[PDB]
Symmetry: D2
Subunit: 250 residues, 4 copies
């Protein structure tokens, strides 16, 4: 019987590439999404055309609120409902936008940025663990630039920092259950859809290795390694996939 | 005239020691507190006996909620109402307790308290502090030296302290144009919990290379004093461990 | 045609496992050794029995000295001689023993511990680059460098300098398409000299399974880093430590 | 009786600023120098005119060789000869120049100088200081940009990374003797005398806090903190004095 993985924010971009590779590797997948219903349903279609009954979608808002724990339990429950098991959790979904110190209220920005990047991963990790020849693991999508952050992204960066602490704390606490917890930290990969071509090229030219951003697939490759049998002694590790960008001084 | 500092969670233990040292240094102080009114007031009275009209108290819950931003604004405003200025913010207040991943407070409450006190409140206080701005303005965040070797079953606390490092770095960068420096002090084992058996306290003490003893509140306060001083005027985004070498000790 | 890899200190233990896995992946290998000629040759014999003329041995002391640069150049040269290319360098050879601050001369200890763990890797990295596809270097680091063993200052200094080399070389060689990464074991194969009871004390500390990494688990991370699956990865040091570095005192 | 300190490479620039500040705080000082005899003597004369018999010079090459241990022992002996004690060691002396990996001194001389001055001499001076033994401490001058290094400075960077390891190893090992071991990490402070103004300004413009390099005095201030009774629980800590430079991405 095939293992099963949940990938959050899997309709588009990096999450999608992660879901596709897991699926190509033999996993059944839960394609979590928030707003991208069309693209989620379309991906599950593609995947199920390749192997019947191997992909399902699951909608949820991962903003912090008093119902977030229920929503996160339900995401994990959805994997058990579809597939009878849950072997891998990929915490990929993420809000990302500036919150300068000097439309949304600051309460909402806190809820969204810290919820998606930190609190929801924690709650999903709880629910994953609670529900548990096995290779169980969690991969959190971190950020290679968290000690050299973008200007005016304090809430986002706080979330990704918290995500590092989660990675370490959960690796430690879940090791006795045979659950490994690790990270993959892109530098610049697929640039924001809203970002102009001038800015995108400014970022590309900063990367030592190729003067280009990572493909979604290059990020996915490292996720695939961490969940694989070739990483069974690896826990609490965060693998940069940044083409050297974090090594470059101002 | 004398500069002014806000210290959160200043009624007792480390926060108290910071407030006393800042006051001894010449600062007027806002003593923020949550539940410890009697201790906050007795500290304010002691300091005002020393120098009249140099200490006030300010009560607020720093749990995450819809009203936290207003509460944090009001804390900063209280320093301005009392003293006409606000030169230093010390983010010290902190909830601390285990939140195991596997099995009275609901988890959403534990999130609100642990992430709100250790991270979100610091961020909102930082905004408000900066929004209100020979000056020497700075922020000191009380971090945790053991953040990469955490206690078992303290994920939310540890997430909170990691977020606080992120804030220290993001705010140091963003506020540097305004002359506001943002730094941290990271205790390892300082004052142990009050009811903790001495025999348990000794297990921790024995781990500390430098003297097999916890740091006093005053030793922690000394590093805060340095960071706010004229001797640290090029220092920003730095987190100073005050841990007796504890974080260098392998399992 | 098949790529080629140089593995230092490859006759035994972790370097042997790295050599074997690279060979199994289709690499031709140079098996470097200092004192372990019999073991290096027996490994070569085994690999060459699988696939003829795909493994050679190369002797060198990697202690720092006036001749270390020339010896390093010759290690790289030996790979070009045997196989006509050098795609992969694994810096694995390492001296490891205590150097207490308060009481071999100390300068010999400096030469061995800093030479093997840092200077030879730097020299080999220069020679490898000077001669220059999926090119990469993997340096064998140490997950416990920030929580070091008591009385191992020079060893620790050397492993710290190797982190610095990994990062400086990743930056500098990126224009040549040469990636430079690290693998950091915690406790893997314990020293042969170490008493059994002492070995169990280390094993007990590891969160994930209360045991040491096999040499093959270390080798697995090396394989990933040299693979096409890691082509955007440079400057990265992957811990393979079963969570040991996360455990407080 | 006044405490005594050894400052390596103290004739000029940051090491002079450190010796001066320690002197102003009440220390007697050994001003170590290599080539800068005239400057070393000029400094010692100034300090001695402020307080008679409180400064001496001490010549030594700190390049690695088989006699470097003897030279480092002698630097510590010189402090005991002059002053009867040695309370503080400041490892400031440093060679600094590029060593490109792909293409003058031989490479082995570059290793001896860059690794010697930045790491091996500090290690040997630490052994000698400890062997000879209140508020005892060592402060190592590190480099805040060691994880975002300058292009073509691998050996220098290797040396500064080794120095971080010594700071940590020695803090652990010398704690039971009450010897604290810490570091101070400038980012951009006094630029090299051969750098032209335009190039200096390129560096200065990178610094978030004031668009300017640290003064020598600012570096010295952090040293003085770490040696003081205000840091008596601090050991194994490295204080960045970089005006935020290490936080600025490419
Ligand atoms: N792209 C990069 O260069 C880069 C760099 C560093 C780190 N990373 C990290 O790698 C991961 C993937 O990056 P990416 O650029 O592919 O991400 P992205 O497109 O910015 O976000 C991925 C998905 O997150 C989901 N999401 C956002 N807000 C949500 C909410 N409130 N509730 C539920 N889901 C929500 C969205 O789902 P819907 O579309 O379904 O609404 C979105 O498609 C992220 O964790 C990111 O922080 C990326
Ligand atoms: N003690 C240590 O060994 C140690 C180690 C590492 C880091 N640190 C850090 O150093 C700081 C000081 O430590 P400590 O042991 O002195 O702290 P503490 O005694 O545990 O807490 C300090 C104060 O935090 C305030 N606080 C708690 N929850 C709050 C809430 N919901 N809203 C508002 N205020 C709240 C409390 O105020 P009231 O009493 O007025 O309710 C309390 O007195 C903390 O940031 C801590 O994390 C300490
Ligand atoms: N084992 C662990 O738990 C562990 C933990 C952390 C890091 N590591 C790192 O992982 C790598 C492999 O570890 P290991 O335990 O397999 O190593 P090892 O058995 O200690 O040493 C590997 C080889 O290093 C070579 N070597 C030693 N001194 C040399 C010199 N002066 N010149 C040339 N070669 C020399 C030896 O080759 P000859 O036998 O041919 O003389 C030896 O067989 C090392 O870099 C180590 O520092 C290992
Ligand atoms: N300046 C900066 O922006 C900066 C940035 C990062 C870190 N730092 C660190 O802070 C410290 C002080 O910086 P700096 O710029 O003042 O240093 P510096 O002027 O470059 O060098 C200081 C002294 O090192 C001594 N030295 C050099 N090679 C030597 C050898 N072979 N033997 C003995 N002594 C030797 C020289 O003494 P003589 O003149 O007597 O020959 C020189 O005056 C250094 O450790 C440095 O790496 C500085
Ligand atoms: C210096 C620097 C600092 C931070 C970054 C972060 C990149 C980044 N993180 C993201 N997270 C989400 N959810 N979506 C994204 N599109 C990104 C993104 C980019 N680009 C990139 C560079
Ligand atoms: C391995 C290890 C990990 C974390 C610690 C942190 C101790 C600590 N943090 C605290 N925060 C608050 N708000 N109050 C406290 N009493 C502590 C505390 C202790 N004791 C100490 C040791
Ligand atoms: C707390 C801690 C600190 C350092 C270590 C290092 C382990 C280690 N490094 C080695 N290097 C070489 N060349 N050979 C080895 N046998 C080891 C080794 C072990 N065991 C392990 C644990
Ligand atoms: C991105 C970056 C990386 C490294 C630096 C280090 C500057 C630096 N280090 C030095 N060491 C010695 N012995 N002398 C110096 N003059 C420097 C120096 C400068 N400038 C500055 C910036």
């Amino acid at each position: 019987e095939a293992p099963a993985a949940v990938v959050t924010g899997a309709a588009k971009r990096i999450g999608r590439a992660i879901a596709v590779k897991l699926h190509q590797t033999g996993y059944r997948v839960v394609i979590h999404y928030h707003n991208s219903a069309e693209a989620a349903v379309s991906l599950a279609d593609e995947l199920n055309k390749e192997r019947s009954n191997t992909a399902v979608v699951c909608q949820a808002d991962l903003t912090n609120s008093n119902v977030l724990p229920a929503s996160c339990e339900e995401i994990i429950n959805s994997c058990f409902r579809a597939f009878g098991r849950c072997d891998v959790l990929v915490n990929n979904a993420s809000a990302f936008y500036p919150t300068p110190l000097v439309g949304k209220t600051v309460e909402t920005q806190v809820a969204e940025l810290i919820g998606t990047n930190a609190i929801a991963p924690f709650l999903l990790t709880m629910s994953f663990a609670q529900r548990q020849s096995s290779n169980l693991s969690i991969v959190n999508l971190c950020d290679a630039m968290v000690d050299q952050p973008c200007m005016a992204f304090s809430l986002y960066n706080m979330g990704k920092h918290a995500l590092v602490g989660l990675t370490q704390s959960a690796a430690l606490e879940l090791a006795p259950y045979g659950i490994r917890v690790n990270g993959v930290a892109p530098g610049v990969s697929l640039l924001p859809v809203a970002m102009g071509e001038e800015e995108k090229d400014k970022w590309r030219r900063k990367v030592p290795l190729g003067r280009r951003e990572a493909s979604a697939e290059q990020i996915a490759d490292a996720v695939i390694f961490l969940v694989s049998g070739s990483a069974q002694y690896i826990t609490g590790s965060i693998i940069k996939v940044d083409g050297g960008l974090s090594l470059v001084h101002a």
